[PDB]
Amino acid sequence: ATFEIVNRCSYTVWAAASKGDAALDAGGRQLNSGESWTINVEPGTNGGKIWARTDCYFDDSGSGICKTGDCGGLLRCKRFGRPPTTLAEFSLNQYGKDYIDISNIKGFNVPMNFSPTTRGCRGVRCAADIVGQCPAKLKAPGGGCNDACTVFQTSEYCCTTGKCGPTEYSRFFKRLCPDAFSYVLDKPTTVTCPGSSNYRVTFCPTA
Protein backbone atom coordinates (compact mmCIF):
# COMPACT_ATOMS: atom_id res chain seq x y z
CA ALA A 1 0.00 0.00 0.00
CA THR A 2 1.21 3.50 -0.74
CA PHE A 3 1.01 6.38 1.71
CA GLU A 4 1.73 9.82 0.32
CA ILE A 5 2.90 11.97 3.23
CA VAL A 6 2.52 15.66 2.50
CA ASN A 7 3.70 18.55 4.61
CA ARG A 8 1.48 21.58 4.12
CA CYS A 9 2.80 23.21 7.30
CA SER A 10 4.75 26.42 6.99
CA TYR A 11 7.49 24.73 9.02
CA THR A 12 9.68 21.68 8.39
CA VAL A 13 8.61 18.37 9.93
CA TRP A 14 10.33 15.01 10.02
CA ALA A 15 7.82 12.36 9.05
CA ALA A 16 7.97 9.02 10.84
CA ALA A 17 6.39 5.63 10.12
CA SER A 18 6.63 2.53 12.31
CA LYS A 19 4.63 -0.45 13.59
CA GLY A 20 6.28 -0.29 17.01
CA ASP A 21 8.84 -3.03 16.64
CA ALA A 22 10.01 -2.13 13.15
CA ALA A 23 10.18 0.77 10.73
CA LEU A 24 7.71 1.06 7.87
CA ASP A 25 9.60 1.75 4.63
CA ALA A 26 12.60 3.97 5.48
CA GLY A 27 11.00 4.79 8.83
CA GLY A 28 11.50 8.55 8.63
CA ARG A 29 12.44 11.47 6.41
CA GLN A 30 12.66 15.24 6.47
CA LEU A 31 9.78 17.10 4.80
CA ASN A 32 10.36 20.80 4.18
CA SER A 33 7.25 22.95 3.78
CA GLY A 34 5.27 21.73 0.78
CA GLU A 35 7.24 18.50 0.23
CA SER A 36 5.69 15.07 -0.42
CA TRP A 37 7.22 11.70 0.47
CA THR A 38 5.57 8.49 -0.68
CA ILE A 39 6.23 5.33 1.28
CA ASN A 40 5.23 1.74 0.78
CA VAL A 41 3.74 -0.25 3.63
CA GLU A 42 3.50 -4.04 3.38
CA PRO A 43 -0.03 -5.48 3.12
CA GLY A 44 -1.17 -6.99 6.42
CA THR A 45 0.64 -4.38 8.51
CA ASN A 46 -1.16 -4.32 11.87
CA GLY A 47 -0.86 -1.39 14.28
CA GLY A 48 1.08 0.92 12.00
CA LYS A 49 1.43 4.61 12.75
CA ILE A 50 2.58 7.72 10.94
CA TRP A 51 3.32 11.00 12.68
CA ALA A 52 5.22 14.26 12.42
CA ARG A 53 8.25 15.29 14.45
CA THR A 54 9.23 18.93 15.00
CA ASP A 55 12.45 20.81 15.72
CA CYS A 56 14.84 18.00 14.93
CA TYR A 57 18.60 17.91 14.60
CA PHE A 58 20.39 14.93 13.08
CA ASP A 59 24.05 14.26 12.32
CA ASP A 60 25.53 12.54 9.25
CA SER A 61 24.75 9.12 10.73
CA GLY A 62 21.10 10.02 11.20
CA SER A 63 21.28 10.35 14.98
CA GLY A 64 20.03 13.30 16.97
CA ILE A 65 16.87 14.53 18.64
CA CYS A 66 13.46 16.10 18.03
CA LYS A 67 11.38 18.24 20.41
CA THR A 68 8.23 16.28 19.64
CA GLY A 69 7.85 12.69 18.43
CA ASP A 70 11.49 11.70 18.86
CA CYS A 71 11.95 7.96 18.25
CA GLY A 72 15.12 7.04 20.13
CA GLY A 73 17.09 9.84 18.49
CA LEU A 74 16.89 8.27 15.03
CA LEU A 75 16.04 9.96 11.74
CA ARG A 76 14.76 6.62 10.45
CA CYS A 77 12.29 5.51 13.10
CA LYS A 78 12.16 1.88 14.16
CA ARG A 79 9.96 2.50 17.23
CA PHE A 80 7.08 4.79 18.13
CA GLY A 81 7.71 8.44 18.95
CA ARG A 82 7.86 10.38 22.20
CA PRO A 83 4.62 12.25 23.08
CA PRO A 84 3.12 14.64 22.25
CA THR A 85 2.37 13.13 18.82
CA THR A 86 -0.79 13.42 16.75
CA LEU A 87 -1.20 9.88 15.34
CA ALA A 88 -2.41 8.52 12.00
CA GLU A 89 -3.11 4.86 12.82
CA PHE A 90 -3.85 1.93 10.57
CA SER A 91 -4.15 -1.83 10.29
CA LEU A 92 -4.22 -3.15 6.75
CA ASN A 93 -5.79 -6.27 5.25
CA GLN A 94 -7.46 -7.35 8.45
CA TYR A 95 -9.89 -9.99 7.25
CA GLY A 96 -10.28 -8.27 3.91
CA LYS A 97 -10.56 -4.70 5.17
CA ASP A 98 -8.38 -1.72 6.14
CA TYR A 99 -8.97 0.27 9.34
CA ILE A 100 -7.82 3.86 9.87
CA ASP A 101 -8.17 6.56 12.53
CA ILE A 102 -6.46 9.56 14.06
CA SER A 103 -5.63 9.52 17.76
CA ASN A 104 -4.83 12.19 20.37
CA ILE A 105 -4.31 9.52 23.08
CA LYS A 106 -0.58 10.28 22.95
CA GLY A 107 -1.13 14.02 22.74
CA PHE A 108 -1.05 16.41 19.80
CA ASN A 109 1.84 18.24 18.11
CA VAL A 110 0.86 18.86 14.47
CA PRO A 111 -2.58 19.03 12.74
CA MET A 112 -3.32 16.20 10.32
CA ASN A 113 -5.73 14.80 7.72
CA PHE A 114 -5.58 11.03 7.04
CA SER A 115 -7.54 10.11 3.90
CA PRO A 116 -7.72 7.30 1.35
CA THR A 117 -6.60 8.16 -2.19
CA THR A 118 -8.70 5.24 -3.45
CA ARG A 119 -12.48 4.74 -3.42
CA GLY A 120 -14.69 3.17 -0.79
CA CYS A 121 -14.42 5.21 2.40
CA ARG A 122 -13.95 8.67 3.85
CA GLY A 123 -10.98 10.30 5.54
CA VAL A 124 -10.50 11.46 9.14
CA ARG A 125 -9.11 14.78 10.32
CA CYS A 126 -7.90 16.67 13.40
CA ALA A 127 -6.80 20.11 12.24
CA ALA A 128 -7.97 22.38 15.06
CA ASP A 129 -5.39 24.51 16.91
CA ILE A 130 -4.97 22.15 19.83
CA VAL A 131 -1.54 23.48 20.69
CA GLY A 132 -2.76 27.08 20.87
CA GLN A 133 -5.81 26.14 22.96
CA CYS A 134 -4.04 23.54 25.13
CA PRO A 135 -4.99 23.55 28.85
CA ALA A 136 -2.14 25.02 30.93
CA LYS A 137 -1.38 21.77 32.76
CA LEU A 138 -1.06 19.80 29.52
CA LYS A 139 1.25 22.21 27.68
CA ALA A 140 4.54 20.50 26.79
CA PRO A 141 7.53 22.76 27.56
CA GLY A 142 9.27 21.09 24.65
CA GLY A 143 6.31 21.92 22.41
CA GLY A 144 2.85 20.49 21.76
CA CYS A 145 -0.07 19.49 23.97
CA ASN A 146 0.46 16.38 26.12
CA ASP A 147 -2.26 13.83 26.80
CA ALA A 148 -3.22 13.46 30.49
CA CYS A 149 -1.77 9.95 30.84
CA THR A 150 1.69 11.22 29.87
CA VAL A 151 1.41 14.11 32.32
CA PHE A 152 -0.18 12.48 35.37
CA GLN A 153 0.35 8.70 35.07
CA THR A 154 -2.90 7.59 36.71
CA SER A 155 -4.92 4.45 36.01
CA GLU A 156 -7.81 6.70 35.03
CA TYR A 157 -6.00 8.69 32.33
CA CYS A 158 -3.93 5.74 31.18
CA CYS A 159 -6.88 3.32 31.33
CA THR A 160 -4.50 0.75 32.73
CA THR A 161 -7.25 -1.38 34.31
CA GLY A 162 -9.24 -1.26 31.10
CA LYS A 163 -11.85 0.58 33.15
CA CYS A 164 -11.75 4.33 32.57
CA GLY A 165 -14.13 7.07 31.53
CA PRO A 166 -13.84 10.43 29.76
CA THR A 167 -12.10 13.19 31.71
CA GLU A 168 -11.95 16.97 31.71
CA TYR A 169 -8.69 16.61 29.76
CA SER A 170 -9.95 14.05 27.24
CA ARG A 171 -13.05 16.20 26.66
CA PHE A 172 -10.76 19.05 25.60
CA PHE A 173 -9.19 16.97 22.82
CA LYS A 174 -12.62 15.62 21.88
CA ARG A 175 -14.15 19.09 21.72
CA LEU A 176 -11.40 20.41 19.44
CA CYS A 177 -11.26 17.20 17.40
CA PRO A 178 -14.47 15.12 17.53
CA ASP A 179 -13.12 12.77 14.87
CA ALA A 180 -10.05 11.57 16.76
CA PHE A 181 -9.66 9.27 19.76
CA SER A 182 -9.41 11.41 22.93
CA TYR A 183 -8.80 8.54 25.40
CA VAL A 184 -8.38 4.76 25.34
CA LEU A 185 -12.06 3.81 25.65
CA ASP A 186 -13.41 6.67 23.54
CA LYS A 187 -16.33 5.92 21.24
CA PRO A 188 -14.48 4.59 18.14
CA THR A 189 -13.89 6.99 15.24
CA THR A 190 -12.20 4.27 13.20
CA VAL A 191 -13.08 4.15 9.49
CA THR A 192 -13.40 0.90 7.55
CA CYS A 193 -11.88 1.03 4.08
CA PRO A 194 -11.57 -1.59 1.35
CA GLY A 195 -8.65 -3.96 1.83
CA SER A 196 -5.49 -2.70 0.12
CA SER A 197 -6.57 0.93 -0.11
CA ASN A 198 -3.93 3.62 -0.58
CA TYR A 199 -3.73 6.80 1.48
CA ARG A 200 -2.42 10.30 1.96
CA VAL A 201 -1.43 11.84 5.29
CA THR A 202 -1.37 15.63 5.16
CA PHE A 203 0.20 17.71 7.92
CA CYS A 204 -1.44 21.14 8.42
CA PRO A 205 -4.35 20.32 6.03
CA THR A 206 -6.18 23.57 6.67
CA ALA A 207 -3.14 25.53 5.51
Side-chain angles (χ1 to χ4, degrees):
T2 64
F3 283 71
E4 178 179 21
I5 306 175
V6 183
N7 180 24
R8 191 171 289 153
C9 303
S10 60
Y11 49 83
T12 299
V13 299
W14 281 261
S18 168
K19 64 187 192 68
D21 66 340
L24 295 182
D25 196 285
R29 211 206 79 176
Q30 178 175 327
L31 281 183
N32 288 158
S33 175
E35 297 194 319
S36 303
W37 175 40
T38 301
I39 61 170
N40 290 90
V41 174
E42 184 172 44
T45 291
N46 189 68
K49 301 191 196 297
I50 285 168
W51 68 101
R53 294 171 287 170
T54 60
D55 309 311
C56 305
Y57 290 91
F58 293 110
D59 59 32
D60 307 319
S61 70
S63 291
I65 184 175
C66 300
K67 290 202 178 178
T68 69
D70 193 53
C71 61
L74 305 183
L75 168 62
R76 294 177 175 182
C77 294
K78 285 80 183 184
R79 307 278 174 173
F80 292 138
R82 187 170 188 279
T85 53
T86 313
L87 301 169
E89 309 183 308
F90 48 90
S91 289
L92 314 181
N93 307 282
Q94 300 299 307
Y95 298 108
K97 294 293 179 181
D98 285 1
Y99 294 92
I100 68 169
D101 70 77
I102 284 173
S103 173
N104 282 142
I105 291 169
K106 288 295 178 173
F108 174 106
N109 62 162
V110 177
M112 141 203 304
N113 175 97
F114 183 14
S115 301
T117 51
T118 46
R119 335 176 76 72
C121 58
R122 41 81 156 61
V124 286
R125 181 181 295 189
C126 176
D129 182 20
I130 285 178
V131 177
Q133 307 295 355
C134 193
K137 286 183 171 183
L138 298 186
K139 296 182 174 191
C145 190
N146 289 310
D147 57 284
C149 170
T150 293
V151 179
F152 300 106
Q153 300 280 280
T154 66
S155 296
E156 193 65 22
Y157 295 137
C158 300
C159 297
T160 79
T161 74
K163 297 178 180 178
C164 62
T167 62
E168 179 155 334
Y169 296 123
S170 73
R171 287 185 185 90
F172 157 71
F173 289 95
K174 197 60 169 186
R175 175 171 65 79
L176 274 282
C177 281
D179 292 332
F181 282 82
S182 62
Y183 70 109
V184 179
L185 299 187
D186 201 352
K187 173 179 171 53
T189 47
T190 303
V191 176
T192 301
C193 289
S196 298
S197 292
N198 292 318
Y199 306 88
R200 175 180 284 135
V201 176
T202 308
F203 298 120
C204 297
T206 192

